[PDB]
Amino acid sequence: LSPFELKDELIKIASSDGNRLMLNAGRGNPNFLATTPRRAFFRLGLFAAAESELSYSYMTTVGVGGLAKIDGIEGRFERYIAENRDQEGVRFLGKSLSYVRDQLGLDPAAFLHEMVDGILGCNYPVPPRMLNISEKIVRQYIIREMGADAIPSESVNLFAVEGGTAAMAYIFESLKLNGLLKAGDKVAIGMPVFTPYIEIPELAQYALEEVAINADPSLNWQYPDSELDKLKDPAIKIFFCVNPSNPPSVKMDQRSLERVRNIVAEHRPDLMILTDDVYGTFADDFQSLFAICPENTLLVYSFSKYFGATGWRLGVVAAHQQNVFDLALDKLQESEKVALDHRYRSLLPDVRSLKFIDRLVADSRAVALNHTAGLSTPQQVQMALFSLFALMDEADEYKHTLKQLIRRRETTLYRELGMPPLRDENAVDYYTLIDLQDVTAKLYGEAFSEWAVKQSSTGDMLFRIADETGIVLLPGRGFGSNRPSGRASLANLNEYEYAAIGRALRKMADELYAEYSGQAQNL
Amino acid sequence: LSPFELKDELIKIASSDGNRLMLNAGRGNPNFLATTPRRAFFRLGLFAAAESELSYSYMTTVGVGGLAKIDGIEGRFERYIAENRDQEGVRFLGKSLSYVRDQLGLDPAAFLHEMVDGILGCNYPVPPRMLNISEKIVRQYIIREMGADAIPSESVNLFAVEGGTAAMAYIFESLKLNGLLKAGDKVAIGMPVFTPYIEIPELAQYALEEVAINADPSLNWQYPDSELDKLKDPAIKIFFCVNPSNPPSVKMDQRSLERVRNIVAEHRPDLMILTDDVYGTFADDFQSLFAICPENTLLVYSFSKYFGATGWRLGVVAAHQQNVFDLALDKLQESEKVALDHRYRSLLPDVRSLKFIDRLVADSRAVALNHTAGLSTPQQVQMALFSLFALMDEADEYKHTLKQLIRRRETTLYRELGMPPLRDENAVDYYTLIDLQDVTAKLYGEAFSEWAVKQSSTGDMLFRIADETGIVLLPGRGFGSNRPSGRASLANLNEYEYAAIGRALRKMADELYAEYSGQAQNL
Amino acid sequence: LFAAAESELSYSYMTTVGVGGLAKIDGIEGRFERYIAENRDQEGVRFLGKSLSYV
Amino acid sequence: RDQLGLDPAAFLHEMVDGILGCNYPVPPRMLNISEKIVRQYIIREMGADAIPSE
Numbered sequence A, B: 001l002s003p004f005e006l007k008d009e010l011i012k013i014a015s016s017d018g019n020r021l022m023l024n025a026g027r028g029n030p031n032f033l034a035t036t037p038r039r040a041f042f043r044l045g046l047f048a049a050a051e052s053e054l055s056y057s058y059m060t061t062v063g064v065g066g067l068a069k070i071d072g073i074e075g076r077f078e079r080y081i082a083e084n085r086d087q088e089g090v091r092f093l094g095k096s097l098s099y100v101r102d103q104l105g106l107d108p109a110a111f112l113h114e115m116v117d118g119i120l121g122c123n124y125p126v127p128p129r130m131l132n133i134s135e136k137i138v139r140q141y142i143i144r145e146m147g148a149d150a151i152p153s154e155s156v157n158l159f160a161v162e163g164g165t166a167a168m169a170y171i172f173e174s175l176k177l178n179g180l181l182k183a184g185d186k187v188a189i190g191m192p193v194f195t196p197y198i199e200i201p202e203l204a205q206y207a208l209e210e211v212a213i214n215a216d217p218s219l220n221w222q223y224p225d226s227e228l229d230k231l232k233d234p235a236i237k238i239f240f241c242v243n244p245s246n247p248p249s250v251k252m253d254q255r256s257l258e259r260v261r262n263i264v265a266e267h268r269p270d271l272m273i274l275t276d277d278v279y280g281t282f283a284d285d286f287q288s289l290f291a292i293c294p295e296n297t298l299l300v301y302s303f304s305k306y307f308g309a310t311g312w313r314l315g316v317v318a319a320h321q322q323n324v325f326d327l328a329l330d331k332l333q334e335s336e337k338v339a340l341d342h343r344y345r346s347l348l349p350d351v352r353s354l355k356f357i358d359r360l361v362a363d364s365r366a367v368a369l370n371h372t373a374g375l376s377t378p379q380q381v382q383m384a385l386f387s388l389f390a391l392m393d394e395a396d397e398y399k400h401t402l403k404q405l406i407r408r409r410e411t412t413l414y415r416e417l418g419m420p421p422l423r424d425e426n427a428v429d430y431y432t433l434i435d436l437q438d439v440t441a442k443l444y445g446e447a448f449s450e451w452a453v454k455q456s457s458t459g460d461m462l463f464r465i466a467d468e469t470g471i472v473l474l475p476g477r478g479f480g481s482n483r484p485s486g487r488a489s490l491a492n493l494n495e496y497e498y499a500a501i502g503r504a505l506r507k508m509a510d511e512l513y514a515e516y517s518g519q520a521q522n523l
Numbered sequence C: 001l002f003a004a005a006e007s008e009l010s011y012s013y014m015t016t017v018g019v020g021g022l023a024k025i026d027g028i029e030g031r032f033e034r035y036i037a038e039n040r041d042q043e044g045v046r047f048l049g050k051s052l053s054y055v
Numbered sequence D: 001r002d003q004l005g006l007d008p009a010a011f012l013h014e015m016v017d018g019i020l021g022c023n024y025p026v027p028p029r030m031l032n033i034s035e036k037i038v039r040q041y042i043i044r045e046m047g048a049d050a051i052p053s054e
């Protein structure tokens, strides 16, 4: 049948917000979430409300408060912390003050006030790009989880945005407005990638040409040298990539990372790299292209999956202080610079000094509104708390818990399918590939496996499952329609449901085997 | 001296986030805030965290939770409410369930779950435009505070956005992408208005022509018929207006509202009205242009000032089900419709049916990302709580408290300036006009008043104050430089500070009077 | 006392004056069960509890 | 501290040392901050809406 037609139909046999999200946005919404940093947030909120009431000078029963005062805040916070040792979030808050004060060396009072004033949401974000201390806390978390083990923290700047969704919207419009990406420009895209990232560059607002950098199934979905080398083409202005990938769900290996490193150093020092690494924490020793080529990369990191915070809309765009986007802006034609000089005039005197990452902020809200732009303060505070939570968990227990949960769901799913496929060191598996050829092969041998692959189709497979379980899987994309296969997220369902997907597929395979047995036995 | 030059200088003699906000964004950040709905929010958060932990099936000390279950939620919420009657926010939550259940007639379980799942921020907003029940709660609040006492609630749709700041950015880009506003188009602007709203239409992204609709000082800053009539010009595609106004801070009277009503009904049924009414709740019996011409108006309402929530970034764009923006989209050239048919193809089959307010959503995040667009769920939940708070306060006590606070600050400011100017029925006074002519006139008579106005200048006045108090006021704009005058917000400072502005200005006036006395006495 | 509480949950507006609404029959058993369990040390409540069973 | 703009610690100390009644009134005419608080009440209740506090 057809791909962009099978999606429309599937949404029918099985309707659900989850199934629609998977089909409409190619995302698996996590059914788990970090609770400790959230309780810490709500508890910090009860402390901040008390701080606000201490500042309202008149008598009322209405419920009005003033701005929290920074003076003596460490004392009052410590009183609050001591008086509520038996509440989880509270213990967390208290330790987080120590982490910021003792391990990061920041001003403790400043920290508490930013969080307090922050969570009350009674002041416009300042600076608009990101709250001062929250920016330093979050980048510490970013640098660590991206495996950017060589980039000094002071060199990374962050722009807080409402998720990777806002991030991409911002980045594409800014690149276009600053003439760093013009129509007809070639944008290399790591493939396969989910639908959304294929349609923006296809928009008429941009009109970009796509150069596919196809992953190779026989290489466990890594990018082969020959494919990565396609970047040496000087006509390719930007490398758009999701890593760990979606849907293959694997992280680029060392080979692939070094490959790109060389390509940038010896052939393309002008190449712009745009990488979405939301799944990084689900991989084992993840390293981002941002860690490898910091000055050629705009890193888009979302807090959505790891923290089970898709609803909080929390993300950051990271850029190295010295980067190719500012250089390209420097190299624009005087003609163009004058034009930009008039766009960001109301911002600063020397518009030519205005950094790219800051134009992102300016651009996000029609420039003239730059001073009331930025992510809400309560969201930034929750973002910093999520960050502290991961940074303070030295033993990575939360991370181990989630990887163990993923694997438990995988074990349940492949119970009647011949056990889960062999794991690699690049395996992430937030999404898992259910390939009819591999399953039948494990169950009844290579011979049957080959016959089956010709008798069935992805449509057949997905329909059979959607029918018997109500779950709609993602068609397997990336390797010539010659292989019936679908994808499931191990992050959005419960055990018995995976158990049902498997049971449904084992039935399907036994049916094919019965047919195959009856046929060969007619020789 | 100069206006766009005096701003740059003032930011020097006195530096502060408050002074910068007033100068850079023409806004007075409230030093007050609604505490009850915020405590209610944090308390709802502790309840939701418990609901989440009830859904995690394994043993850990890490702090992981699952999705809250809707079944039996009314029972558990009621247990929570009964067990915490002594906490303010809790009492509020409980009553809010009744308001939604008994006065709005919505599903109680649905309500609780939306709030619970909402505050946990573990799911993508759905629908992207706005959470179902939050949309019905907030529009009830909007319709009431806008004085839209004749528009059935079912006819108003809302799009939750991150403040009026995001709203305007969205609306201008959407109008341009859908060809409802093209370059060279005439946009009428209610003046005076703060700087930000003057620079967007001036952007090269848009390139619009401004037709000023000047308010008349002698009319207490209302718009005279002759000025409003300038809208009959068929070349004026959109009327851009802030009401209650900033900086004059008055609400359009009945005359002005009816005037525009007729202009739309008998001459311009195709005119698009874009109104920002954030200050509405500070006026007495406010009525929005949206209440008067619902089908010709896109209402932008912010929760920032009234709730002292500038940091939460909460706002909504309201549109009537049947409106001129969709009609104009219907009237576009087939040529154009085909072009749009390809922009929003991935959204729906019959793109021509896609309503304008929904294109706002689609446009906000590059279309392809429409399904993960929308305001974060926790913000929407806080927005609904703020709304319920105002709706449940039948006696408008919170509102009276804030109007009384405003007036107290005004009384303190004009103590040594001859008492505050006479109040009108259209007076809002979130910002107050300190006019040297009126003050001197009240203090030493009309004669002196006239001599003084020629001896001084706005620069002089603002510098004298900035010097002696550290507070930088807003130059008085709107009536020919012939009148030294500045503006202060009665919402961002404390009593003793207003007391100091006044003391500084009385000194200045006495000095002018001493000179004037010495002169005339030489006849 | 339990009814007083029930009525108060039905008043949808904010006031300190002390006005209640009509008790709702939905979910009444659970709310009553909570009230019984929280006041096992009050004679009257133990009796109320038994009454529900008898009926 | 917020509306009158006086020193909070000084205020608290005057009230605490004051109510303990362990020090002679100083200065004799009236305690420094009490005078400023009370005069703001006086001016207001006597309708002296134009007289400067100081």
Ligand SMILES: *Cc1c(COP(=O)(O)O)cnc(C)c1O
Pocket: A026, A027, A028, A162, A163, A164, A165, A166, A194, A242, A246, A276, A278, A302, A303, A304, A305, A310, A313, A314, A315, B372
């Ligand atoms: C799930 C997902 C995200 C999350 O989008 P947010 O707007 O950040 O919630 C980002 N990128 C990819 C590839 C995803 O799978």
Ligand SMILES: *Cc1c(COP(=O)(O)O)cnc(C)c1O
Pocket: A372, B026, B027, B028, B162, B163, B164, B165, B166, B194, B242, B246, B276, B278, B302, B303, B304, B305, B310, B313, B314, B315
């Ligand atoms: C203060 C103000 C607002 C608030 O902007 P938000 O982005 O909604 O915080 C809106 N419009 C005007 C005219 C203002 O004065």
